[PDB]
Amino acid sequence: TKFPKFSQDLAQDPTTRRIWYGIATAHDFETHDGMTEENLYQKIFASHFGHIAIIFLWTSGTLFHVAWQGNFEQWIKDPLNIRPIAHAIWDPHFGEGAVNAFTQAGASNPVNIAYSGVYHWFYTIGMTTNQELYSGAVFLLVLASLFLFAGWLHLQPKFRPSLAWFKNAESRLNHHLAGLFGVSSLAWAGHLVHVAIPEARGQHVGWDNFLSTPPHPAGLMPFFTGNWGVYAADPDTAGHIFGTSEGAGTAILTFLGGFHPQTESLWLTDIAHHHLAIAVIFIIAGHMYRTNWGIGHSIKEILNAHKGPLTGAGHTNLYDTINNSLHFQLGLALASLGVITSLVAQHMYSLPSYAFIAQDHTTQAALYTHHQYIAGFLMVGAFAHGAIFFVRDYDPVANKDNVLARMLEHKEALISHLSWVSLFLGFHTLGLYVHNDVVVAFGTPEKQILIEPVFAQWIQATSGKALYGFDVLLSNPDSIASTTGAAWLPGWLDAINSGTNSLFLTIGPGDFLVHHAIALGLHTTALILIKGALDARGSKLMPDKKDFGYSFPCDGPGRGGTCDISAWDAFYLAMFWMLNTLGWLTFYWHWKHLGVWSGNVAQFNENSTYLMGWFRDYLWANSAQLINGYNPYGVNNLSVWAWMFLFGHLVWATGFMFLISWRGYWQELIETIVWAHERTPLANLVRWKDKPVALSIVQARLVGLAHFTVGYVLTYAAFLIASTAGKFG
Amino acid sequence: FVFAFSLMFLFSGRGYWQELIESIVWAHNKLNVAPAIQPRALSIIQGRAVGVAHYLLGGIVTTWAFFLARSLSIG
Amino acid sequence: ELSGQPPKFGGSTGGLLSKANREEKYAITWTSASEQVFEMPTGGAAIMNEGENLLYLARKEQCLALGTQLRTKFKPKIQDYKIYRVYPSGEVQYLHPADGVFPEKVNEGREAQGTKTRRIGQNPEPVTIKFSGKAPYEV
Amino acid sequence: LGTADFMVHHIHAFTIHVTALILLKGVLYARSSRLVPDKANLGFRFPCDGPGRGGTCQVSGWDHVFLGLFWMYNS
Amino acid sequence: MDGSYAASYLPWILIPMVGWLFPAVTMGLLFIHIESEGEG
Amino acid sequence: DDFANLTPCSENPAYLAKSKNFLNTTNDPNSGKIRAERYASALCGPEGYPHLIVDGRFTHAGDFLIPSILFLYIAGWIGWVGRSYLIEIRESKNPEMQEVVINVPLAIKKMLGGFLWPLAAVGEYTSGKLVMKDSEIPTSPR
Amino acid sequence: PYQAIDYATQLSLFTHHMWIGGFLIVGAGAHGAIFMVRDYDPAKNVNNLLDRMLRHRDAIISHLNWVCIFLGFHS
Amino acid sequence: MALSDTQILAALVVALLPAFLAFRLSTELYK
Amino acid sequence: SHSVKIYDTCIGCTQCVRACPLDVLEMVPWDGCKAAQIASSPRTEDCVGCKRCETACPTDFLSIRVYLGAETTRSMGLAY
Ligand code: CLA
Ligand code: CLA
Ligand code: CLA
Ligand code: CLA
Ligand code: CLA
Ligand code: CLA
Ligand SMILES: CC1=C(/C=C/C(C)=C/C=C/C(C)=C\C=C\C=C(C)\C=C\C=C(C)\C=C\C2=C[C@H](C)[C@H](O)CC2(C)C)C(C)(C)C[C@@H](O)C1
Ligand code: SF4
Ligand code: SF4
Ligand code: SF4
Numbered sequence A: 001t002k003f004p005k006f007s008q009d010l011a012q013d014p015t016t017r018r019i020w021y022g023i024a025t026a027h028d029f030e031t032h033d034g035m036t037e038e039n040l041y042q043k044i045f046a047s048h049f050g051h052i053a054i055i056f057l058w059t060s061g062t063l064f065h066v067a068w069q070g071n072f073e074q075w076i077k078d079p080l081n082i083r084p085i086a087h088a089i090w091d092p093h094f095g096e097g098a099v100n101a102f103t104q105a106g107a108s109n110p111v112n113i114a115y116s117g118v119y120h121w122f123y124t125i126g127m128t129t130n131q132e133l134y135s136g137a138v139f140l141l142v143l144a145s146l147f148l149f150a151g152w153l154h155l156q157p158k159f160r161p162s163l164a165w166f167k168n169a170e171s172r173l174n175h176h177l178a179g180l181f182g183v184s185s186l187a188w189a190g191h192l193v194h195v196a197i198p199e200a201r202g203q204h205v206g207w208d209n210f211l212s213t214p215p216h217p218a219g220l221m222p223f224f225t226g227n228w229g230v231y232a233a234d235p236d237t238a239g240h241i242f243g244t245s246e247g248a249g250t251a252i253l254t255f256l257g258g259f260h261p262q263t264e265s266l267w268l269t270d271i272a273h274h275h276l277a278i279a280v281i282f283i284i285a286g287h288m289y290r291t292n293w294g295i296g297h298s299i300k301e302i303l304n305a306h307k308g309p310l311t312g313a314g315h316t317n318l319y320d321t322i323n324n325s326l327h328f329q330l331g332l333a334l335a336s337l338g339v340i341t342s343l344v345a346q347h348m349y350s351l352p353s354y355a356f357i358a359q360d361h362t363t364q365a366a367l368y369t370h371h372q373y374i375a376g377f378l379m380v381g382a383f384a385h386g387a388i389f390f391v392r393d394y395d396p397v398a399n400k401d402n403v404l405a406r407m408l409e410h411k412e413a414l415i416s417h418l419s420w421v422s423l424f425l426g427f428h429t430l431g432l433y434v435h436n437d438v439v440v441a442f443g444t445p446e447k448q449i450l451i452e453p454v455f456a457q458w459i460q461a462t463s464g465k466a467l468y469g470f471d472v473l474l475s476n477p478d479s480i481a482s483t484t485g486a487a488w489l490p491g492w493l494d495a496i497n498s499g500t501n502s503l504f505l506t507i508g509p510g511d512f513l514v515h516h517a518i519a520l521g522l523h524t525t526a527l528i529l530i531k532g533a534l535d536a537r538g539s540k541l542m543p544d545k546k547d548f549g550y551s552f553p554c555d556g557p558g559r560g561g562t563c564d565i566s567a568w569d570a571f572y573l574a575m576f577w578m579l580n581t582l583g584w585l586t587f588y589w590h591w592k593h594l595g596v597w598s599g600n601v602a603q604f605n606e607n608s609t610y611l612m613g614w615f616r617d618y619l620w621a622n623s624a625q626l627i628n629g630y631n632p633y634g635v636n637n638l639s640v641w642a643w644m645f646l647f648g649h650l651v652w653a654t655g656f657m658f659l660i661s662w663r664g665y666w667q668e669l670i671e672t673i674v675w676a677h678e679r680t681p682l683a684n685l686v687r688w689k690d691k692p693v694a695l696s697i698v699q700a701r702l703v704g705l706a707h708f709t710v711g712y713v714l715t716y717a718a719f720l721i722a723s724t725a726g727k728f729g
Numbered sequence B: 001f002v003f004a005f006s007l008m009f010l011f012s013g014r015g016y017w018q019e020l021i022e023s024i025v026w027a028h029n030k031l032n033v034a035p036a037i038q039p040r041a042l043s044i045i046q047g048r049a050v051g052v053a054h055y056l057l058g059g060i061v062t063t064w065a066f067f068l069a070r071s072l073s074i075g
Numbered sequence C: 001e002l003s004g005q006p007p008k009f010g011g012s013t014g015g016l017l018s019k020a021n022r023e024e025k026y027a028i029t030w031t032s033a034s035e036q037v038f039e040m041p042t043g044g045a046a047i048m049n050e051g052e053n054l055l056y057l058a059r060k061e062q063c064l065a066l067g068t069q070l071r072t073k074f075k076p077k078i079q080d081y082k083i084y085r086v087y088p089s090g091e092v093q094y095l096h097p098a099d100g101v102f103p104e105k106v107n108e109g110r111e112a113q114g115t116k117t118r119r120i121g122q123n124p125e126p127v128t129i130k131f132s133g134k135a136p137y138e139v
Numbered sequence D: 001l002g003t004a005d006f007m008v009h010h011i012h013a014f015t016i017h018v019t020a021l022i023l024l025k026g027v028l029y030a031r032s033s034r035l036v037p038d039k040a041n042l043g044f045r046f047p048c049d050g051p052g053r054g055g056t057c058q059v060s061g062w063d064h065v066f067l068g069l070f071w072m073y074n075s
Numbered sequence E: 001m002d003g004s005y006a007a008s009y010l011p012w013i014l015i016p017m018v019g020w021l022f023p024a025v026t027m028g029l030l031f032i033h034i035e036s037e038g039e040g
Numbered sequence F: 001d002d003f004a005n006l007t008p009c010s011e012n013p014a015y016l017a018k019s020k021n022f023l024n025t026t027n028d029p030n031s032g033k034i035r036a037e038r039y040a041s042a043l044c045g046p047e048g049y050p051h052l053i054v055d056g057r058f059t060h061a062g063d064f065l066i067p068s069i070l071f072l073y074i075a076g077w078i079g080w081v082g083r084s085y086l087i088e089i090r091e092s093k094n095p096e097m098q099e100v101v102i103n104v105p106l107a108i109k110k111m112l113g114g115f116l117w118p119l120a121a122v123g124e125y126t127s128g129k130l131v132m133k134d135s136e137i138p139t140s141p142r
Numbered sequence G: 001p002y003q004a005i006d007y008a009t010q011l012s013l014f015t016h017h018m019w020i021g022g023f024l025i026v027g028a029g030a031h032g033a034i035f036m037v038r039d040y041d042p043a044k045n046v047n048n049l050l051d052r053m054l055r056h057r058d059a060i061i062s063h064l065n066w067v068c069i070f071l072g073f074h075s
Numbered sequence H: 001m002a003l004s005d006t007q008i009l010a011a012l013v014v015a016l017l018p019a020f021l022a023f024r025l026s027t028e029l030y031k
Numbered sequence I: 001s002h003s004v005k006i007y008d009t010c011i012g013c014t015q016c017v018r019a020c021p022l023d024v025l026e027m028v029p030w031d032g033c034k035a036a037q038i039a040s041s042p043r044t045e046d047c048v049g050c051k052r053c054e055t056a057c058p059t060d061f062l063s064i065r066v067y068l069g070a071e072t073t074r075s076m077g078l079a080y
Helices: A017-024 A037-069 A096-102 A118-124 A130-154 A169-200 A221-225 A228-232 A268-285 A299-305 A318-324 A326-350 A361-392 A403-409 A411-441 A454-463 A489-496 A509-535 A567-598 A601-607 A611-622 A639-659 A663-678 A697-727 B002-010 B014-030 B044-072 C018-022 C060-072 D003-028 D061-074 E010-035 F013-019 F031-039 F065-089 F104-112 F114-127 G007-038 G049-055 G057-074 H005-030 I015-019 I052-056
Strands: A085-088 A111-113 C025-032 C036-039 C045-048 C051-057 C082-086 C092-096 I003-006 I026-029 I037-040 I064-067
Touching: A017 A697, A037 A085, A037 A118, A037 A130, A037 H005, A096 A639, A130 H005, A169 A268, A169 A299, A221 A228, A299 A318, A318 A326, A318 A403, A326 A361, A361 A509, A361 A567, A361 A697, A403 A411, A411 A509, A411 A611, A411 B014, A454 A509, A509 A567, A509 A601, A509 B014, A567 A601, A567 A611, A567 A697, A567 B014, A601 A611, A611 A697, A639 A697, A663 D003, A663 D061, A663 G057, B002 B044, B044 D061, B044 G007, C025 C060, C036 C060, C051 C060, C060 C082, C060 C092, D003 D061, D003 G007, D003 G057, D061 G007, F013 F031, F065 F104, F065 F114, F104 F114, G049 G057, I003 I037, I015 I052, I052 I064
Parallel strands: none
Antiparallel strands: A085 A111, C025 C051, C025 C082, C036 C045, C082 C092, I003 I064, I026 I037
């Protein structure tokens, strides 16, 4: 059989497994038949072009559907009272009740309500009309076409890059720092000052008249004469109304700090100076490494020079290890991307940048949950692909006595102390929670163990939170740090001391307990991933694991039993802990913000100290409207979310039987079914081409994990959206 | 709780736990406090039995508490 | 070619399938010293007759399981069974025992196969053989 | 008894027949099967035969009991 | 199933192809390709 | 000025309102009054329940420091007696049998000698036989 | 006397003896397979009902699997 | 103001180009 | 088909050959051990990968190792 063309051993398989594994190893280019390094790199280049084109097409589709079936031009007239529309509904399976229920947001047909928060983003960046959205969609279509053609071209024989071109770290770093990061940020700052701010102040600026409309009145002379302060004079007053000329200043680069009084979001001019400054810094950074002139650093000598007397060989030979190994680079990139996605979530829920996005609680919750889940997935993938590197691309002799080898030396100490910290957190956190539960249940909630989060409150004070009376640093009015004449200090101190936003929310004993539980989850997931990565090469039970690859089922029932001794199994186990930690995180965030938005912070404050309050006040209480989306009486707009809630519960349940029941049972059952088919008249005329067999052990684990994760995500998303929409939306 | 706890044993295998016990045994050996009875991860059959036992216990206890509370609270 | 009266069996649903007439089947023959009851690997009990016997099974594992039962669970031990592979065209390939001596005991004239001149810990690192269609044990 | 009683009684029938199927497959196929033709010699309580034959996890009769316990709980 | 957006007749015809025609054609082509014996 | 959000329980209106109806934990009829008295000196939140402050300050040493010292002493006692009994039985002929069948005489002899566990531990560390060398411990392949 | 009006006692008794019955049935399904593995001897079972059961076991399991699928699907 | 039918049809026609380019890229990558 | 390798740490106890249910292994004369015999895998195309030979090996690490590879009808041990 032809398929799969990249693996002969799979193509000669006569069973249905050939269909499955061929899918699973399709995009693993290294293990393909007759694969060279150069071909691998070029194929990766083309595939990355493809993913970029897919991203651009997805964004174009978002824009086009919003412009076509949305209410963008009506939404901007009243962002605080109109639900944005995602896309239209066309379902012949609908009934009259569903049609009436889903005709919402002033539409004339069944429509969905957008929760990605793209309306606020488009409004903030200056898009105000449907035709602008349409032009953006068409331009993104053209851009995706260009990138697809670029992939095809650089895949052609005359345009195939050489191996040396791919292994040019210095030139890539210089171009991608100064150009990709710096020039793009500078262009965004120029877009903000030339277009976004004038449109926010009522002046319409487009391609038609942006050449005849200067950003600043006395423009482009002070920048070259050095009198930059002119661009900071006359900022937007506190009475400014977004999108109008009432109370609007003329400054284009400010450091006001805090939030816009009306939109409850960061000042646009602050964003302009911020992106300009980081563009300048990135452009400076991009002139660091030597490419083909005399000046510039070289990464290899920097790495080979930083060696100490305690670590042995230090960072020697690390340049070759990183450059020759693609999995090392992928793991580093995934770790960094996950960290900065977590950063995006944490600094975006507390410092909103888009106008009126702080008042749309549903979109805020959705965005936080989404980007935090993405960050968790990326953080898991970093460790997984690092373990893959250790299995495949790690050379012990080359990286001898350096830090990479030193990691595998005290790996037992690493795992032991990690196990100790995980157990130490878990025991004394579960003990405190159960103690509070038991004490509260016995009718004496006064004997609870409530620890004030003193250190985090001290940090809040050091940033300027004057509620705990710590009187330290920025909270100290006489401290040198608070008497530097910083232009952002008044606005920042005003915003931090206001209780109307999420900027440094007040904390208590429940936040202490839940943050320590999150710490337990993080350390346990790290323990699983790290032990898998370090034991991937081998352990006492399997000294020769590297010979068996990264993912293998087991080594049989002998020598104890094996049963998930591979590093792929470590990743598979760590996915569950990642999901559990993300669940705790999102539960804490959502309940705290429900209390904040309703003004009933005391409910969370006094009910989060014991687990029964979590079970009753959060889960039981907030499901009242969700599960009533469709009743024996009728149907409301939350019907789809109730259906998806049950759907997620069902898929989560279904994953359990790929996770618990194992292969031999189903193999024998399929044997019986095969007998039944072969012995049946009028069905013997039809025969299979691939012999039906049960799913393999690793495939079964993967499928169970997939159903599990899909159910988890769908259930929580449905519950969160339904609860927040019913409460506030 | 116990139901969820059972998912430790049903969803996992014993090689992971054996390697973890190897690391912990190294830890206890560094301090010369290693036990004479060498610790081992539970067998595959024992793991399945423990998982099913704790699972059934948790589920049945949940149903028992729910039923008794509801039936004593309905007069 | 292959001779022997089939053991008296009532027939079961666990026997051969289309693979026997499409891909191959297996045959086991042995000499019984008395007509006595033995256990079908496919389910059930059947009596084997005095003298030659011949049985068709679907897998080599089933034939070797029957051979193990014959060798272990009968006081007049049956050590003379022979297992052949029968192709749909008609070719019969002698499989077990290979040279007439059981593989458990060493017999001269055999050739070592799959034997490596090193120990398990001396296998080459994967990174030194990557991008070639080889595995550390294959080297 | 109405429509709901009809549905629930036939659901009961479905669950009971499935549990009976699991336990009957355990009892009948405990001696041997087309996959493993000598399970009787391996014993009644063994975890598997190995990763070969595509994977032979949970083939013993004890594993069939372990699987039937959950379905009894469900029913 | 009835909409007030511009060119409301498009989903009347586009969705079925994405619903039936495209999935069926893709099923057939992939099934033929993965099952085409030989030549690789 | 520390803990501006935490007030003394002796004046917090919520604590005083809720301390009248404190339940009796034991058969003693005035255990609730004793609990209210003992908790009136703590730092109550807006909901009237005592809060424990753990930052190192000695004014609130009773919250963490004293129980910490008590637990550390007891846990060190337990660990030291266990380790000493293990090392002692390791020189016998059936160390595993004495693991399941406890040598109660020797067990209690080690039980009663654990109150000086800090001095024994520091002498052990200085003698160098508290911690084994890395080259004398079995290790898994890297 | 006075048991029907005590709804809690009714529910508790029903559920308790229900669970006991389910567990005992599963135990039957287990110890029957134990007998088949250990105490079953083919010599004493020739063309008797046990052997005939062991002969059309594939048909039994296939038809039972089909009826389980049909019941679950339709209900 | 809301779009027109001609705009939607033109968007479809424009998107017909990246479809052809993506087909070419997929065929090239399969090779 | 799967691969079966025998390394020079074999002591010739013949347990692996006895444990093999599909007659894949054989005992050949040798000189490296006291028993002067080593295991071999001539009929490796019939191996299913049950790892019984690995379970039977008493050396500190298995002198016989099985590496699962391409899957055939025989390797899957199918009867249909
Ligand atoms: C990936 C982006 C994306 C997505 C998810 C959707 C989603 C949808 N569109 Mg849509 N659309 C998009 C981009 C997108 N659109 C773009 C860019 C255009 C301009 C050409 C349109 C033009 C369009 C029209 C004219 C109509 C829809 C309709 C619909 C709905 C019916 C389902 C469907 O797509 O089939 C029908 C729609 C198409 C087949 C449009 C072609 C798809 C685009 C052009 C290419 C996307 C390729 C994509 C990246 C492939 C990813 C591969 C990956 C899955 C592996 C659904 C909500 C219908 C609707 O409103 O029903 C209520 C409808 O009538 N779309
Ligand atoms: C019988 C049940 C049923 C069915 C058939 C549908 C069908 C539909 N609903 Mg719907 N709905 C239902 C019940 C149902 N609904 C219920 C009970 C509710 C709650 C009241 C809703 C609420 C609802 C809303 C709110 C919306 C719909 C929409 C839609 C349409 C989406 C178009 C589509 O699927 O293309 C897109 C197809 C896909 C995205 C495929 C995804 C599934 C596969 C498995 C993923 C692909 C995996 C893999 C890569 C496949 C490879 C390729 C393959 C060929 C091999 C479609 C007509 C939407 C609509 O009208 O917009 C057009 C919409 O907005 N429905
Ligand atoms: C100035 C020259 C230049 C530029 C612009 C690029 C640009 C790019 N190269 Mg590149 N490259 C260059 C020179 C350059 N290269 C040279 C000289 C070499 C040879 C040494 C290479 C060799 C090379 C290789 C080998 C590869 C690339 C690839 C890529 C693409 C990766 C996708 C990406 O990062 O974008 C997306 C990311 C960004 C735009 C910035 C990252 C986002 C930041 C970090 C955080 C987010 C900021 C902000 C908050 C997010 C916006 C929020 C908003 C949505 C609201 C990208 C388009 C890859 C590819 O295949 O692409 C086709 C690839 O594999 N390059
Ligand atoms: C830029 C990101 C990136 C890139 C380029 C790669 C690249 C690679 N990874 Mg990697 N990985 C990543 C992120 C990434 N990964 C992350 C974030 C994780 C953590 C989840 C992993 C976890 C991971 C593992 C555990 C493994 C790889 C492997 C691989 C290699 C090839 C196998 C493969 O993934 O194809 C095959 C991929 C698939 C078959 C994916 C199937 C899963 C589908 C998409 C789920 C679909 C869900 C379903 C449709 C939901 C429907 C919903 C509906 C009902 C509504 C390849 C080098 C494998 C390897 O070792 O190769 C060297 C391997 O074992 N990766
Ligand atoms: C609610 C369920 C639950 C619980 C409590 C645990 C608990 C634990 N898991 Mg775990 N796990 C679970 C579900 C759970 N897991 C699931 C579903 C998976 C996916 C398969 C995993 C996967 C997993 C992996 C992969 C790993 C863990 C690890 C751990 C340990 C880390 C230490 C810790 O968190 O606190 C400390 C422990 C606790 C607080 C639990 C003790 C709770 C009891 C009540 C204490 C008292 C015992 C009691 C007196 C006994 C009386 C019994 C008697 C009545 C018969 C711990 C034992 C890691 C580990 O071993 O770390 C060393 C590890 O490597 N688990
Ligand atoms: C009349 C009742 C009865 C009798 C006499 C037997 C007799 C026997 N059974 Mg059997 N069995 C029964 C009912 C019975 N069984 C039922 C109802 C089931 C279904 C659950 C089983 C399932 C079963 C299996 C699966 C196995 C046996 C085995 C055995 C043999 C002894 C080994 C054994 O289980 O002891 C050892 C017993 C234990 C270790 C039980 C201790 C652990 C239990 C489960 C904990 C219970 C906890 C409790 C409910 C709540 C505590 C809460 C906690 C917080 C305090 C023996 C022939 C074994 C065998 O093969 O023998 C040939 C075997 O493998 N039985
Ligand atoms: C001797 C002994 C053993 C062994 C002991 C060993 C080997 C110990 C080894 C320890 C090592 C290697 C390292 C230890 C590190 C300890 C640290 C880092 C302590 C930190 C303390 C802090 C940060 C105090 C913090 C604040 C201190 C303050 C008083 C308040 O609260 C507030 C608060 C909590 C912030 C056993 C285990 C074998 C048996 C025992 O019985 C005895
Ligand atoms: S994973 Fe399955 S086949 Fe492998 S040892 Fe465990 S039970 Fe046996
Ligand atoms: S894995 Fe099984 S079939 Fe293969 S050689 Fe070893 S014992 Fe024989
Ligand atoms: S079991 Fe191991 S030591 Fe014994 S003969 Fe086989 S390979 Fe050699």
